[PDB]
Amino acid sequence: ATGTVSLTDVGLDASYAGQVSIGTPAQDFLVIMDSGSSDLWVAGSTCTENFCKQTYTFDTSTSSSFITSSEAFNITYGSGDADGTLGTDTVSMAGFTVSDQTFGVVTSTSANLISYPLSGLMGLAWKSIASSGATPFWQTLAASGDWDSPEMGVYLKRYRGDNTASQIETDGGQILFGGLNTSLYNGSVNYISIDESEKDYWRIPLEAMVIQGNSVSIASSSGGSNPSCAIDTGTTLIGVPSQTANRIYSQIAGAEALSASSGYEGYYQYPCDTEVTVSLQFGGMSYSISNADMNLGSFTRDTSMCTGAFFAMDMSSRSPVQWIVGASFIKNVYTAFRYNPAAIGFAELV
Ligand SMILES: *[C@@H]1O[C@H](CO)[C@@H](O[C@@H]2O[C@H](CO)[C@@H](O)[C@H](O)[C@H]2NC(C)=O)[C@H](O)[C@H]1NC(C)=O
Ligand code: NA
Numbered sequence: 096a097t098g099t100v101s102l103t104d105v106g107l108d109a110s111y112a113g114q115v116s117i118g119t120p121a122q123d124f125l126v127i128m129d130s131g132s133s134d135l136w137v138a139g140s141t142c143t144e145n146f147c148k149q150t151y152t153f154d155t156s157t158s159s160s161f162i163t164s165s166e167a168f169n170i171t172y173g174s175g176d177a178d179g180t181l182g183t184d185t186v187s188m189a190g191f192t193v194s195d196q197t198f199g200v201v202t203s204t205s206a207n208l209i210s211y212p213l214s215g216l217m218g219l220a221w222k223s224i225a226s227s228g229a230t231p232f233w234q235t236l237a238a239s240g241d242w243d244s245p246e247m248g249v250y251l252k253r254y255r256g257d258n259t260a261s262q263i264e265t266d267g268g269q270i271l272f273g274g275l276n277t278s279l280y281n282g283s284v285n286y287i288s289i290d291e292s293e294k295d296y297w298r299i300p301l302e303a304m305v306i307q308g309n310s311v312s313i314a315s316s317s318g319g320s321n322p323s324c325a326i327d328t329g330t331t332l333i334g335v336p337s338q339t340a341n342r343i344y345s346q347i348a349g350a351e352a353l354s355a356s357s358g359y360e361g362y363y364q365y366p367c368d369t370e371v372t373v374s375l376q377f378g379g380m381s382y383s384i385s386n387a388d389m390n391l392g393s394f395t396r397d398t399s400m401c402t403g404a405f406f407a408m409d410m411s412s413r414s415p416v417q418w419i420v421g422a423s424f425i426k427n428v429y430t431a432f433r434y435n436p437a438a439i440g441f442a443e444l445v
């Protein structure tokens with residue numbers, strides 16, 4: 096079989112979310128679809144955080160199939176963390192069901208992790224990085240032979256650069272579970288193979304980067320000659336090692352690091368009237384990033400300067416990834432996440 100999740104684009108390409116349903120009878124939630132993590136969680140109805148007061152929450156007491164657990168749930172993202180306890184219940188998405196899906200019932204988070212209309216997050220990466228130890232929903236489906244083809248196809252719609260766009264766009268893209276949507280891409284899919292040691296994040300090697308026509312050195316202390324890049328639908332921008340970010344912005348005349356005084360340490364800005372030409376090389380092909388994705392607008396009162404989508408994020412030397420490649424990149428390609436043989440594919444959008 097196949098099944099489609101319609102995506103809502105929240106926050107001007109900040110987060111892409113789809114509907115999950117949990118419990119009996121079903122309780123429905125809009126959750127971040129996150130190819131950079133592997134746990135499902137939803138804000139619980141007992142949560143006393145302010146955001147929980149203003150969004151839909153999961154009432155464990157009104158699900159007749161809910162199996163409680165005292166086991167703690169704790170997950171950390173680059174943007175913050177979420178805590179609560181594990182639970183088990185029937186979960187559906189895209190017309191599929193997992194009867195005894197383990198997930199987090201969250202009752203605290205770091206400030207501003209999520210808000211209305213979101214209620215949680217569904218991890219689309221591999222079991223080995225699931226904090227809960229549970230097999231991810233998507234992975235159960237793939238492993239069971241339920242899918243026509245063992246892959247997920249992703250389209251993220253772009254609103255950044257549209258001056259009349261809303262903070263909630265329900266026409267936000269699509270995830271196809273169990274195949275690729277041939278109406279949304281053109282030409283052949285270029286698959287980059289992922290070996291058995293790399294089934295954690297969805298990650299692939301960066302071969303090269305070109306900005307303003309200059310090939311940037313992508314060597315790093317953590318990642319050696321070539322970084323391993325999380326292809327991460329759950330992040331907004333492109334996070335890279337500090338050294339690499341410095342090198343990137345050195346290729347744009349007039350670029351400078353934003354001071355920590357601004358409140359934007361790790362970000363860089365450059366002249367707003369410079370259209371930046373930039374591509375990332377994966378699997379022997381260059382993939383362009385449109386100027387509408389690259390230019391985030393002015394972050395300070397100096398309106399002649401605009402912030403770029405690449406930012407400095409030094410990561411744990413315990414991380415297997417040195418780049419986090421978010422929606423800023425992904426909006427420019429149709430993306431296939433292939434379970435078997437394990438691979439990430441890219442195609443030109445139609
Ligand atoms: C592939 O993507 C296309 C384009 O988004 C989907 O087409 C829509 O499907 C719905 C109902 O299934 C129609 O009512 C819409 O009018 C279609 N939109 C357009 C622009 O044609 C299509 O459903 C997707 N296919 C799969 C299998 O997910
Ligand atoms: Na993530």
Ligand code: NA
Pocket residue numbers: 341345
């Ligand atoms: Na420099």
